[PDB]
């Protein structure tokens, strides 16, 4: 029953910890609870004991990793605040990708990511938003947020590698561009090179700027 | 080589579209290359001949089903027809459900999807977007149409089922308000509420508006 954990209240953060490590150098994939529990040198029966289930640790691990909520600072320039949880949820959801999937899969509710939340509706209630343009800012910034790193994350596999060189990465390139070229105007293969080497999040402070103003 | 299954240009087409009703009805796990096989009434080699492996099946997968690429009315609206192709893309996300964890890992770069994309930015061309602008124009569409599909299906588990009464609802989404007010200020389980509540879509055109006028 997705979220259910939270309903329901060697030590648990240590192993959510050593689960995320897990995750970060893996995936949802290599998450293994034998591997798991050899990391925190116990038997499997010691985590079970803790951590209920494989899924149950996915949603501790969803939300201890979600950033803190954003500050609201004192000058009331609630767009500098909203701009700034935004960021800080971005480069969250980029260090640890493999949270992405598992969102998809259940809202957070666990407690970190509902005082994330509340802090985004205090800083809109605090620009007097009314409630109904508060959902739709609200629901703007995480929907933006959330694509915005999806997209990076799969672009990574295009943009450049730590050891390539540039001629080596164009020579990778290449023919993804001759055949985006072919088929439809050069605006697109244009767009395909950007994608490729827009800075790591360039692209993503350039849309959230595009959407506060917005508001 | 995520992508590459492009560049290298029963029949597939049948293939493809057993394995998007596999993938529909089950998930990405689902989609076994026996199963799909018998439901084709093959051996699985005869898949194996056309489609080399379950990986780029997928990337055949997530083209197959992207949406026509948006019309362009000749009223000049673009603000319309990015509205347009933006729902059209955000449908198919929501029918598809599966396609979000496969974007993920590999960018679109096949024929429907760059021709979805090419069609994007000619709108925006003819509004007299500039390189630049059309860059963030056509992300904030992108990330917020994904960002919105990611979040409307986590929110699927927390909404009425079919055959269940709004009491029974209420009753089992009741748990979950009560921990919200209880640690954060009512205006979060007030969000929580309709969130769960929001019609199917509702909240993705709302925050489309907030963000086409954006632009």
Redesign the interface.
Known sequence: ???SI??RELSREQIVQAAVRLLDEGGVRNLRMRQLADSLNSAPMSLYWHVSTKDDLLELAIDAVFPDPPSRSGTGDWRDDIKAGATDLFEVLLRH?WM??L?????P?G?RA??H??AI??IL?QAHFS??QL??????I???????A??E???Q??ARQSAESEEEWVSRLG??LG??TQ???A??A???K??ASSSTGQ?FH??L???V???
Not at 103 to 107: N, V
Not at 142 to 148: D, H, K, W
């Open positions: 029953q997705p979220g939270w309903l990708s992405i999937e969102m998809g899969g259940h809202p509710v407690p509902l005082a939340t509340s509706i205090e209630e409630p109904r959902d739709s800012a609200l629901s703007a995480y929907y933006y947020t959330v694509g915005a999806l997209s994350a799969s672009w596999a295009m023919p993804y055949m985006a088929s439809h105007p605006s697109l244009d767009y395909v950007r994608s692209r350039d849309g700027e595009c959407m103003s917005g508001m």
